[PDB]
Design an enzyme around this catalytic site. Structure first.
Site: not given
Ligand SMILES: OC[C@H]1O[C@@H](O[C@H]2[C@H](O)[C@@H](O)[C@H](O[C@H]3[C@H](O)[C@@H](O)[C@H](O[C@H]4[C@H](O)[C@@H](O)[C@H](O[C@H]5[C@H](O)[C@@H](O)[C@H](O[C@H]6[C@H](O)[C@@H](O)[C@H](O)O[C@@H]6CO)O[C@@H]5CO)O[C@@H]4CO)O[C@@H]3CO)O[C@@H]2CO)[C@H](O)[C@@H](O)[C@@H]1O
Ligand SMILES: OC[C@H]1O[C@@H](O[C@H]2[C@H](O)[C@@H](O)[C@H](O)O[C@@H]2CO)[C@H](O)[C@@H](O)[C@@H]1O
Ligand SMILES: [K+]
Ligand SMILES: CC(=O)N[C@@H]1[C@@H](O)[C@H](O)[C@@H](CO)O[C@H]1O
Ligand SMILES: *[C@@H]1O[C@H](CO)[C@@H](O)[C@H](O)[C@H]1NC(C)=O
Ligand SMILES: *[C@@H]1O[C@H](CO)[C@@H](O)[C@H](O)[C@H]1NC(C)=O
Ligand SMILES: [Cl-]
Ligand SMILES: [K+]
Ligand SMILES: [K+]
Ligand code: NA
Length: 430
Positions: A207, A209, A212, A223
Site C-alpha cells: 500500500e 498512501d 491521507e 507500507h
Molecule cells: O433487501 C432487499 C432490498 O435490498 C436493497 O439493496 C440494499 C441491501 O439490502 C442492503 O444490504 C445494502 O446495505 C449496504 C448499505 O447500502 C451500505 O451503506 C453499507 O456500506 C457500508 C459497508 O457495509 C461497510 O462494510 C463499510 O465499512 C467501511 C468502514 O466504515 C470504513 O471505515 C473503512 O474505511 C477504510 C477505507 O475505505 C480505506 O480507504 C482505508 O485505507 O482504511 C479504512 C479502514 O481503516 O472501510 C470499510 C469497508 O472496508 O461501510 C459502508 C458505508 O457505511 O453496506 C451495506 C451492506 O453491508 O444496501 C442496499 C441498497 O439499499 C435493494 O436496493 C432493493 O431493491 C431490495 O429490495
Molecule cells: O492503525 C491506525 C493508523 O496507524 C498509523 O500508524 C501510526 C501508529 O498507529 C502509531 O502508534 C505511531 O506512533 O504512529 C504511526 C504513524 O502515524 C498508520 O500509519 C495508519 O495507516 C493507520 O491507519
Molecule cells: K489502509
C-alpha cells in the site's frame, strides 16, 4: 461473488491524463467497493448478508457463499453520494445511513487501471475544505489484481466490475469477499458499527498512501509487505488495525510516514496556512529510483504543492534527529530511531519491498472514511493520547476527544471531498 441482475452496473465517468516530456486525456471511470453493495442469492432477492451478519441458509460455507451470492449494481449518487463531473470526483460523507465510500479507477468495465509509478510523477488536485476533525479523504495505491481476482479465483465472477478484490497493508478482515471465498467462517459483528464485522481471513498487499488528509492534517506513508500482491492471512496472524496485535502479520501497519505537522512544521498546512486548506490545491508526488529507470528500486519519494499557481515546497523536518523534506532510507531510519517503536517498516523490507509492490503495478483508490478504531487521532491529533509532550505525538490541532464516528456523522454529515485532474507521467511532465 457472482454478478447480480436487478440493477445495471454503470461506472460513473472520470477522465485523467497521461503526460509526456504534452498531455492526453484518457477516458476512465470509477467503481464502488463490493462491501457497500447489496449481496443476494443468485436469481433471488433474498439477502446473503443483512445488518452485520450472514444468511447461513445460503452462506453455510465460505465457498458456497461465493458461488451462490451475487453483488448488484449501485445508485452512485442516490445511495452513496458519489458523483463525477469531467475530471472531478466527489465523495459525500453521510447519505442516509451510508458513511463514505471507497472507489477504484477503471481501465474498462472489467479491469482496474494499473499504474506503474516507479520513476514517474503523479499529480492530483484536492478540496479538503469540507473535511473536519476525524475524517480522512484518501487517495492511494494498492497492489490489487487488475481483474479483481476473476482469473485466479473461480468463484469470483463479479471481479473489478463490482469492486471485488481489495487488499491493503492493514490486512483487512472486514471484507466480505477475499480470493473468491466469502468471509463467513468466524464472522463476528462489530458491536458499534451496524453494517460491519470481522471474519477469519484478511487481504494483505502493499500500500502506498500518497494522500491521507483532512482540512487539519495530511500524511504521506508507504507500507511494504513481505510479498507485494495478495496474501490471505488468518485471524490474529493478520496483524493490522482488525487484530489484537497490529505487528503480528506480514505487512507494515505503521509505515514510514511524513506529516509536516508531526515533524514540527505547524504553520504549513491548515486553514489559512502556507497550503490553505480552505481552498483547493494540487499535490505532486515523485517516485525516484536508485538508477533513474522504471526498473530500479525506490530510493526517494518527493513532494510539492501548487496553490493559486504558486509552487510550494514540502517543508523540511524541524525534529532533532530527523532531516529533510523527502522520504528515503536515511529518513525512515531516522524516524524510527527518533520516534521509537516497532521497526515494522524495516521488518517488512522498507523501500525495497515498497518498490516490489509498485513494480507489480497498483490500483488507484479514492476513499472517504471515519475510524471506529482510533478516531483518526493518529492523523490530526495527539497520539497516543497520553504521549503529550513527546516528539511526534502531536500530528495536528484536533482535540483528543475528536473523531468519534457517531459524533462526526451526526454533526458533520454534509462533509465531502473532491479529487480532480489526475495526471501521471515522467518527472516534470504533469
Ligand atoms: O433487501 C432487499 C432490498 O435490498 C436493497 O439493496 C440494499 C441491501 O439490502 C442492503 O444490504 C445494502 O446495505 C449496504 C448499505 O447500502 C451500505 O451503506 C453499507 O456500506 C457500508 C459497508 O457495509 C461497510 O462494510 C463499510 O465499512 C467501511 C468502514 O466504515 C470504513 O471505515 C473503512 O474505511 C477504510 C477505507 O475505505 C480505506 O480507504 C482505508 O485505507 O482504511 C479504512 C479502514 O481503516 O472501510 C470499510 C469497508 O472496508 O461501510 C459502508 C458505508 O457505511 O453496506 C451495506 C451492506 O453491508 O444496501 C442496499 C441498497 O439499499 C435493494 O436496493 C432493493 O431493491 C431490495 O429490495
Ligand atoms: O492503525 C491506525 C493508523 O496507524 C498509523 O500508524 C501510526 C501508529 O498507529 C502509531 O502508534 C505511531 O506512533 O504512529 C504511526 C504513524 O502515524 C498508520 O500509519 C495508519 O495507516 C493507520 O491507519
Ligand atoms: K489502509
Ligand atoms: C523527465 C525529466 O525531466 N526528469 C527530470 C529528472 O531527470 C531530473 O532529475 C529533474 C531535475 O532536473 O527534472 C526532471
Ligand atoms: C429468476 O428469479 C426469479 C426471482 O426469484 C424467479 O421468479 C425465476 O424463477 C428465476 N429463474 C429460475 C428459477 O431459473
Ligand atoms: C498510554 O496509552 C496507551 C493507549 O491506551 C496504553 O497502551 C498505555 O498502557 C497507556 N499508559 C501508559 C503509561 O503508556
Ligand atoms: Cl511524520
Ligand atoms: K458524471
Ligand atoms: K482544535
Ligand atoms: Na512496538
Amino acid at each position: 461473488q457472482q454478478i447480480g441482475t436487478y440493477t445495471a452496473e454503470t461506472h460513473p465517468s472520470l477522465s485523467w491524463s497521461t503526460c509526456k516530456s504534452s498531455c492526453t486525456t484518457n477516458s476512465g471511470a470509477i467503481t464502488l467497493d463490493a462491501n457497500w453493495r447489496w449481496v443476494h442469492g443468485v436469481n433471488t432477492s433474498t439477502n446473503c448478508y443483512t445488518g452485520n451478519t450472514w444468511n447461513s441458509a445460503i452462506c453455510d460455507t465460505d465457498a458456497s457463499c461465493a458461488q451462490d451470492c451475487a453483488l448488484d449494481g449501485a445508485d452512485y449518487s442516490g445511495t452513496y453520494g458519489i458523483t463525477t463531473s469531467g475530471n472531478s470526483l466527489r465523495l459525500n460523507f453521510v447519505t442516509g445511513s451510508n458513511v463514505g465510500s471507497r472507489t477504484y479507477l477503471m481501465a474498462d468495465n472489467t479491469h482496474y487501471q494499473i499504474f506503474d509509478l516507479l520513476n514517474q510523477e503523479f499529480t492530483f488536485t484536492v478540496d479538503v475544505s469540507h473535511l473536519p476533525c476525524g475524517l480522512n479523504g484518501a487517495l492511494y495505491f494498492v497492489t490489487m489484481d487488475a481483474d479483481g481476482g476473476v482469473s485466479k479465483y473461480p468463484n469470483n465472477k463479479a471481479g473489478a466490475q463490482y469492486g471485488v478484490g481489495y487488499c491493503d497493508s492493514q490486512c483487512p478482515r472486514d471484507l466480505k469477499f477475499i480470493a473468491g471465498q466469502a468471509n463467513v467462517e468466524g464472522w463476528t459483528p462489530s458491536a458499534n458499527n451496524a453494517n460491519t464485522g470481522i471474519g477469519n481471513h484478511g487481504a494483505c498487499c502493499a500500500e502506498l498512501d500518497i494522500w491521507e488528509a483532512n482540512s487539519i492534517s495530511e500524511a504521506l506513508t508507504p507500507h511494504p509487505c513481505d510479498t507485494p500482491g495478495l496474501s490471505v492471512c488468518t485471524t490474529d496472524a493478520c496483524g493490522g488495525t482488525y487484530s489484537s496485535d497490529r505487528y503480528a502479520g506480514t505487512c507494515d501497519p505503521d509505515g514510514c510516514d511524513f506529516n509536516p505537522y508531526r515533524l514540527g512544521v505547524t504553520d504549513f498546512y491548515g486553514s489559512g496556512k502556507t497550503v490553505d486548506t480552505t481552498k483547493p490545491f494540487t499535490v505532486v508526488t515523485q517516485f525516484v529510483t536508485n538508477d533513474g529507470t522504471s526498473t530500479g528500486s525506490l530510493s526517494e519519494i518527493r513532494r510539492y504543492y501548487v496553490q493559486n499557481g504558486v509552487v510550494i515546497p514540502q517543508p523540511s523536518s524541524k525534529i532533532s534527529g530527523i532531516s529533510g523534506n523527502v522520504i528515503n532510507s536515511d529518513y525512515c531510519a531516522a524516524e524510527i530511531s527518533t520516534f521509537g517503536g516497532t521497526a515494522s517498516f524495516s521488518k517488512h523490507g522498507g523501500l525495497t519491498n515498497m518498490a516490489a509492490g509498485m513494480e507489480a503495478g497498483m490500483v488507484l483508490v479514492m476513499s472517504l472514511w471515519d475510524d471506529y478504531a482510533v478516531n483518526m487521532l493518529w492523523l490530526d491529533s495527539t497520539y497516543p493520547t497520553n504521549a503529550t509532550g513527546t516528539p511526534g505525538a502531536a500530528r495536528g490541532t484536533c482535540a483528543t476527544t475528536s473523531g468519534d464516528p457517531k459524533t462526526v456523522e451526526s454533526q458533520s454529515g454534509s462533509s465531502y471531498v473532491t479529487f480532480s485532474d489526475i495526471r501521471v507521467g515522467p518527472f516534470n511532465s504533469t
